[PDB]
Design a protein around this nucleic acid. Structure first.
Ligand SMILES: [Mg+2]
Ligand SMILES: [Mg+2]
Ligand SMILES: [Mg+2]
Ligand SMILES: [Mg+2]
Ligand SMILES: [Mg+2]
Ligand SMILES: [Mg+2]
Ligand SMILES: [Mg+2]
Ligand SMILES: [Mg+2]
Ligand SMILES: [Mg+2]
Ligand SMILES: [Mg+2]
Ligand SMILES: [Mg+2]
Ligand SMILES: [Mg+2]
Ligand SMILES: [Mg+2]
Ligand SMILES: [Mg+2]
Ligand SMILES: [Mg+2]
Ligand SMILES: [Mg+2]
Ligand SMILES: [Mg+2]
Ligand SMILES: [Mg+2]
Ligand SMILES: [Mg+2]
Ligand SMILES: [Mg+2]
Ligand SMILES: [Mg+2]
Ligand SMILES: [Mg+2]
Ligand SMILES: [Mg+2]
Ligand SMILES: [Mg+2]
Ligand SMILES: [Mg+2]
Ligand SMILES: [Mg+2]
Ligand SMILES: [Mg+2]
Ligand SMILES: [Mg+2]
Ligand SMILES: [Mg+2]
Ligand SMILES: [Mg+2]
Ligand SMILES: [Mg+2]
Ligand SMILES: [Mg+2]
Ligand SMILES: [Mg+2]
Lengths: 129, 80, 32, 82, 123, 205, 156
RNA sequence: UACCCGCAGAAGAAGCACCGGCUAACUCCGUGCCAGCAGCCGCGGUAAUACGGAGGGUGCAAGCGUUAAUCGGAAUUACUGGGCGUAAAGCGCACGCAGGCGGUUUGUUAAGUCAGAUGUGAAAUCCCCGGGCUCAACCUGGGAACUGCAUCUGAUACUGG
RNA sequence: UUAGCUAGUAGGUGGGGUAACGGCUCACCUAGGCGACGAUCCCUAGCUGGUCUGAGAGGAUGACCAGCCACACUGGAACU
């Protein structure tokens, strides 16, 4: 049934962008939240907002520029059927550095560049142009 | 500083012996998926302390029999 | 020998394609 | 008998010897334990033709390793130089 | 398709058989002209195309095209076949070599001489 | 291993002056430089993408007088080396000994230079170098040897050169007949009419 | 200062009560050696006329591409009908490594340095379209900075 | 012997394939679906740039063609990197063991994972910077690499327990 | 379009043997062991460093050079 929450989140973001919706709400998860934060930092969304106690719903607010959408591409890379791990040499360059790659390291989820700087690789979560 | 493996026991009908599946979680070469690949080993045990479906830690030694070159060091999680 | 020879294929009826005819259409010309 | 000796590795007519530690029974160019320098007879001016890793050779000798006559000569030469 | 599926059963290379099997990975092969004859090419062409049934050295029986204008090949003549094929002919997958063994070079030829076993004209 | 035949024909084919003759007398007088060689000379078919590149390649090869395998090797070398590839190739071509000699002005033509090199007249750092294809490095002095200094052809060549445009990457002296290869040439310092990119593309093909 | 190639010219038919009626289609592409490119598919009963038409078409409906120096900014995939097309920037000196219709569009555009592959169909009209699409979609570092609201040095 | 020095005299030293399109290179004569060509498409039936000869040209060059055999193009077995309403492709429909995948929170572990280290990964070969044979090929000094395995010491986001 | 294979067979005890552990061998005792992660059977093949090709991932390959293996007219056997 429901097997990759992260993937689902990404799809939600994509569809919202397509449809020119302002806001995307979904179930929150720690990893998801982290991802959202990362996105915000990298300027791909306007803001995120968690809300609720028992079953909290993350609510991201999508960003547009001169009409068209900002989140141009947002692919998963690791995925439950085939996970991916990269060593700090092998971390990829999305859109030749113009986009980002969210990567989960032992020092938290971060963007690929950040990881590289740190000097450590990790499970690659998703590319986002 | 002893190289050892922890496996589920599979069968113990033969005396002073067991056979112990050792699951190793390898990456595939081409496809990059991780598979569980299984290594059944014959393991020498005196006293016949092991049961079936039991978690057991072993070590590699001098060959006891034709098939048998491993000897168990400790048992864990024996009976359901 | 005469008879069978006649029967053999080298002496089959020949017909030619047409250039302005009915079955004329050349998709690609001889030369570019 | 583990022997420090030469090993012909060059062109035709332009030999370049590797000096090596080898079980005697192995072939000239074949299997060796360690390569402990080198030697060039056809050495131009303003370049080192010979160069030996002397500590390693000493160690090998200690272990109980014979030295080929040419290798001995080379060693002697090197010592003279230094 | 699915990575799991591929793991289970990996994907297989399309094993392409050779169109010149008598050769058996040899660039030529010698053999004797069982018989020699003319054939008709398949539509739309017209000719009497000259072609010999050759028993090869390695046990095979093939038939070979004889290029150029004219040829001396008889029964019990020993020739060198090479992998080549006249398209128009059903079942001919081999060219004779002109000028190798008993076969002679084409008479009176002055362009692409090599390909028909002809020596350079004298001067 | 050399092109021996008619020189101006090649030039005609190319469409340019390849400098295959000394330059005493202007190429337009010696041949129909505009009309390409042969029975179907006047006719100008429209050249394909493949064709143009090939032509360009030929031109370059013709200019320096180099056969295909060697050219290919040079290209490969250029590719291997760092930076721009076409430029590198050009530099390599320049670097050849005969070419250098020609530039200096001891050859009237590049062919002449090559001949000189062959015939044991050209010393590179005071050691006789006989091979045309020999690369000349930076700060390598290159001279006519004393036996070959008396030849009237050499002085003629020098004179011719003096009329021609002088290269910046060399420094040459007429009385001593020795020149110094100062630095590998920049692309700008060579002729713009050659398009090295095309050649690169061809070899990629 | 439009430099322009005719990529491909092709005969096309229409059958009628009498018989086959021929025509020609030309496919040109014009570029300025900088940002601007456009393609023109023209059709006429005689070739030259068709070509002219194509040229005319090309000259209007041009398109601006952001170019880093003489190359693409970053790797890009353009697609259209059968042909799908990958093209990736490269080092000064590599040249236009590209096949057919695709090469032509690049040349006029004023890319001088690409590795380009055309997967799928290589149907000239479609592949040129694909290439154009790819070029169009491709955005610069400056462009992305604006989008994300950061410095160009932060985007790097 | 390499190498050098002298001697004479343009002297002893250019061929092979191709030129319809793909594919760089075109005309005349002979033939007349013949004789022949041909990798594919396809030439030849009396004006053949596609056969054979010539002249002319193009490409390679002490070689040049043909064949055989591999990878490439072929994203045409598609891990990177394809597909399946109609082009080949969704079991007739379920249930279900093995198998694969698994919502959310905490703790813990540290197997995967990541980092660093130590041992090893023979030399040669490949690549980088050099050196030596007049140059090159060739030889050669040092490095890098050999994407791995094993252990030890850490990290704990993600997966696993 | 090879699904079952194996009785020194799987394990134990004790003797004997080996330079050495060991069903290596023998006598007794248990009835195992291997197998859909492909056992068994059939066809082909010396393995590696490398080599060719390829943008790479791969694919094909294993002349020379070097490492390991095996064979020495065929089948056996030990002696030194
Ligand atoms: Mg591991
Ligand atoms: Mg001496
Ligand atoms: Mg040569
Ligand atoms: Mg380069
Ligand atoms: Mg058409
Ligand atoms: Mg297709
Ligand atoms: Mg042409
Ligand atoms: Mg022919
Ligand atoms: Mg006539
Ligand atoms: Mg005629
Ligand atoms: Mg006719
Ligand atoms: Mg002809
Ligand atoms: Mg072939
Ligand atoms: Mg493939
Ligand atoms: Mg193929
Ligand atoms: Mg398909
Ligand atoms: Mg169907
Ligand atoms: Mg159905
Ligand atoms: Mg989970
Ligand atoms: Mg599970
Ligand atoms: Mg660990
Ligand atoms: Mg590690
Ligand atoms: Mg040198
Ligand atoms: Mg090595
Ligand atoms: Mg957990
Ligand atoms: Mg015993
Ligand atoms: Mg005993
Ligand atoms: Mg065999
Ligand atoms: Mg490929
Ligand atoms: Mg024997
Ligand atoms: Mg024999
Ligand atoms: Mg025997
Ligand atoms: Mg015997």
């Amino acid at each position: 049934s429901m097997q990759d929450p992260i993937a689902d989140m990404l799809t939600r973001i994509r569809n919202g962008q397509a449809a020119n919706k302002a806001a995307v709400t979904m179930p929150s998860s720690k990893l998801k939240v982290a991802i959202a934060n990362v996105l915000k930092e990298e300027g791909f969304i306007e803001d995120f907002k968690v809300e609720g106690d028992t079953k909290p719903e993350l609510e991201l607010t999508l960003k547009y520029f001169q009409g068209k959408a900002v989140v141009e591409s947002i692919q998963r890379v690791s995925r439950p059927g085939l996970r991916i791990y990269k060593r700090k040499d092998e971390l990829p360059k999305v859109m030749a550095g113009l986009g980002i790659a969210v990567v989960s390291t032992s020092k938290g989820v971060m963007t690929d560049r950040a990881a590289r700087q740190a000097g450590l690789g990790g499970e690659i979560i998703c590319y986002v142009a | 500083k002893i190289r050892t493996l922890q496996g589920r026991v599979v069968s113990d009908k033969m005396e002073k012996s067991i056979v112990v599946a050792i699951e190793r979680f390898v990456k595939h070469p081409i496809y990059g998926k991780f598979i569980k690949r299984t290594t059944k080993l014959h393991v020498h045990d005196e006293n016949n302390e092991c049961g079936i479906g039991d978690v057991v830690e072993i070590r590699e030694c001098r060959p006891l029999s034709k098939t048998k070159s491993w000897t168990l060091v400790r048992v864990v999680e024996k009976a359901v | 020998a005469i008879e069978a020879l006649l029967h053999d294929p080298l002496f089959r009826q020949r017909v030619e394609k047409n250039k302005k005819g009915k079955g004329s259409y050349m998709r690609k010309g001889k030369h570019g | 008998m583990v022997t420090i000796r030469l090993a012909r590795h060059g062109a035709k007519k332009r030999p370049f010897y590797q000096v090596v530690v080898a079980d005697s029974r192995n072939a000239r160019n074949g299997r060796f334990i360690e390569r402990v320098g080198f030697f060039n007879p056809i050495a131009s001016e303003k370049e080192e033709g010979t160069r030996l890793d002397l500590d390693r050779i000493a160690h090998w000798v200690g272990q109980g390793a014979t030295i080929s006559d040419r290798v001995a000569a080379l060693i002697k030469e090197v010592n003279k130089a230094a | 398709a699915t990575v799991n599926q591929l793991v289970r059963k990996p994907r297989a290379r399309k094993v392409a058989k050779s169109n010149v099997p008598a050769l058996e990975a040899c660039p030529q092969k010698r053999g004797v002209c069982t018989r020699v004859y003319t054939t008709t090419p398949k539509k739309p062409n017209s000719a009497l195309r000259k072609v010999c049934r050759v028993r090869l050295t390695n046990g095979f029986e093939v038939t070979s095209y004889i290029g150029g204008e004219g040829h001396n090949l008889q029964e019990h003549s020993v020739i060198l076949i090479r992998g080549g094929r006249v398209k128009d002919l059903p079942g001919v997958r081999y060219h004779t070599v002109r000028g190798a063994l008993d076969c002679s070079g084409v008479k009176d030829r002055k362009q692409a001489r090599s390909k028909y076993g002809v020596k350079r004209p004298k001067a | 291993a050399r092109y021996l035949g008619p020189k101006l024909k090649l030039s005609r084919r190319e469409g340019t002056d390849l400098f295959l003759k000394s330059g005493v007398r202007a190429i337009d007088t010696k041949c129909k430089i505009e009309q390409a060689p042969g029975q179907h000379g006047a006719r100008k078919p429209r050249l394909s993408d493949y064709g143009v590149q090939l032509r360009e390649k030929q031109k370059v090869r013709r200019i320096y007088g180099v056969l295909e395998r060697q050219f290919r090797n040079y290209y490969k070398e250029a590719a291997r080396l760092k930076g721009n590839t076409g430029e590198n190739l050009l530099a390599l071509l320049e670097g050849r000994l005969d070419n250098v000699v020609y530039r200096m002005g001891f050859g009237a033509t590049r062919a002449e230079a090559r001949q000189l090199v062959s015939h044991k007249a050209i010393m590179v750092n005071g050691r006789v170098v006989n091979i045309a294809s020999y690369q000349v490095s930076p700060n390598d002095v290159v001279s006519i040897r004393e036996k070959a200094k008396k030849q009237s052809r050499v002085k003629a060549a020098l004179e011719l050169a003096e009329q021609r445009e002088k290269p910046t990457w060399l420094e040459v002296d007429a009385g001593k007949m020795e020149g110094t290869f100062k630095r590998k040439p920049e692309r700008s310092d060579l002729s713009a009419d050659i398009n090295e990119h095309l050649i690169v593309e061809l070899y990629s093909k | 200062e439009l430099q322009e190639k005719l990529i491909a010219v092709n005969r096309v038919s229409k059958t009628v009560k009498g018989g086959r009626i021929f025509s020609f289609t030309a496919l040109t592409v014009v570029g300025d050696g900088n940002g601007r490119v456009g393609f023109g598919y023209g059709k006429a009963r005689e070739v030259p006329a068709a070509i002219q038409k194509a040229m005319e078409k090309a000259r209007r409906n041009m398109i601006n591409v952001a170019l880093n120096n003489g190359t693409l900014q970053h790797p890009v995939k353009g697609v259209h009908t059968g042909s799908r097309v990958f093209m990736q920037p490269a080092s000064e000196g590599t040249g236009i490594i590209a096949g057919g219709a695709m090469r032509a569009v690049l040349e006029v555009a004023g890319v001088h340095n690409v590795l380009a592959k055309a997967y799928g169909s290589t149907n000239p009209i479609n592949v040129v379209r694909a290439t154009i699409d790819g070029l169009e979609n491709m955005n610069s570092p400056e462009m992305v900075a604006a989008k994300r609201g950061k410095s160009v040095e932060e985007i790097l």
